[PDB]
Every structure is written in structure tokens, then in C-alpha cells.
Swiss-Prot record, chain A:
Name of this protein: Disease resistance protein RGA5
Description of its domains: The HMA-like (RATX1) domain is responsible for the specific recognition of AVR effectors.
Tissue: Expressed in leaves.
Native source organism of the sequence: Oryza sativa subsp. japonica (Rice)
First-to-last residue of the parent protein present: 991 to 1069 of 1116
Annotated localization: Cytoplasm
Gene name tied to this protein: RGA5
Residue numbers spanned by region HMA-like domain: 10-79
Length: 79, 62
């Protein structure tokens, strides 16, 4: 893919209006190949920060979108 | 799921961080070394910032 071998931070806005859906969305992101850590951020706790190496961002957003309805990729960045 | 274990980190009453790990892997959470054993349990349980670690196999099996 486009980020093969690269350490990326990927920020996704996800519909997660309660603690149950936040736990579910983090676990979903964590299941994507290459993901090392997931963090919930934003004052409304509505963004996942996904960090890893070789992450396929297409697969990550597609999976979040299918299981939570709304998910949008805000940025991909190196670190 | 691509690794054996999910490690949850409780801070100030909530889980806002999780980490992937294989059995018997050493990982780093922030600047802290963590050992995840063969039952996916993390050590140390209490990190120096007093956050608490909990681990289990992913729902995609061991």
C-alpha cells in the first residue's frame, strides 16, 4: 500500500456517542494490520488516533464506517 | 486482528488508550517498558503514572 514501511499517525472521526461504542471502535481499529496503539481524543471524544507501521488507511476507514455508520479520515501524518 | 493481545489502559476512570501485543512481547507504553506474558497479561499492572493495564486475547482468538 501507500504507507508500507512508514510509521504513521492516522486520525479518524468516528460516531461513538457512548463508552460502549468507544470501546468497540477502538478494538476495531486495533484489529487492523499494523496498528500498534489507538487513542480517543477531542473534547467530544469523537476522534481515534491510530498509530502503527504499514497501516492500510482505506481498510481502516471502511471497517469503522461499516460498524459505526459514520467515519471520516481527517489526516495521515508521519512520526 | 493481527496480534494476539489487546492491552487496555485505564486513566482517571476511563479507557482512552489500547495497545496491541503478541504473547511474550515487550512493548512500550509512553516511555514505560511493558511485558505481555503468554496469557496476554501486562506487567507492570500499575504504571509509574498510576494508570492501570489490563490485557486479553483478541476476539479473533489466541
Amino acid at each position: 500500500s501507500a504507507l508500507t514501511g512508514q510509521r504513521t499517525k492516522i486520525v479518524v472521526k468516528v460516531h461513538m456517542p457512548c463508552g460502549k461504542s468507544r470501546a468497540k471502535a477502538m478494538a476495531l481499529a486495533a484489529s487492523v494490520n499494523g496498528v500498534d496503539s489507538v487513542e480517543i481524543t477531542g473534547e467530544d471524544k469523537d476522534r481515534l488516533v491510530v498509530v502503527g507501521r504499514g497501516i492500510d488507511p482505506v481498510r481502516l476507514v471502511a471497517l469503522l464506517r461499516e460498524k459505526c455508520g459514520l467515519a471520516e479520515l481527517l489526516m495521515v501524518e508521519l512520526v | 486482528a493481527w496480534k494476539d493481545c489487546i492491552i487496555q489502559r485505564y486513566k482517571d476512570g476511563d479507557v482512552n488508550n489500547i495497545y496491541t501485543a503478541n504473547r511474550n512481547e515487550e512493548i512500550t507504553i509512553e516511555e514505560y517498558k511493558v511485558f505481555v506474558n503468554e496469557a496476554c497479561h501486562p506487567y507492570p499492572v500499575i504504571l509509574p503514572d498510576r494508570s492501570v493495564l489490563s490485557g486479553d486475547f483478541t476476539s479473533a482468538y489466541a
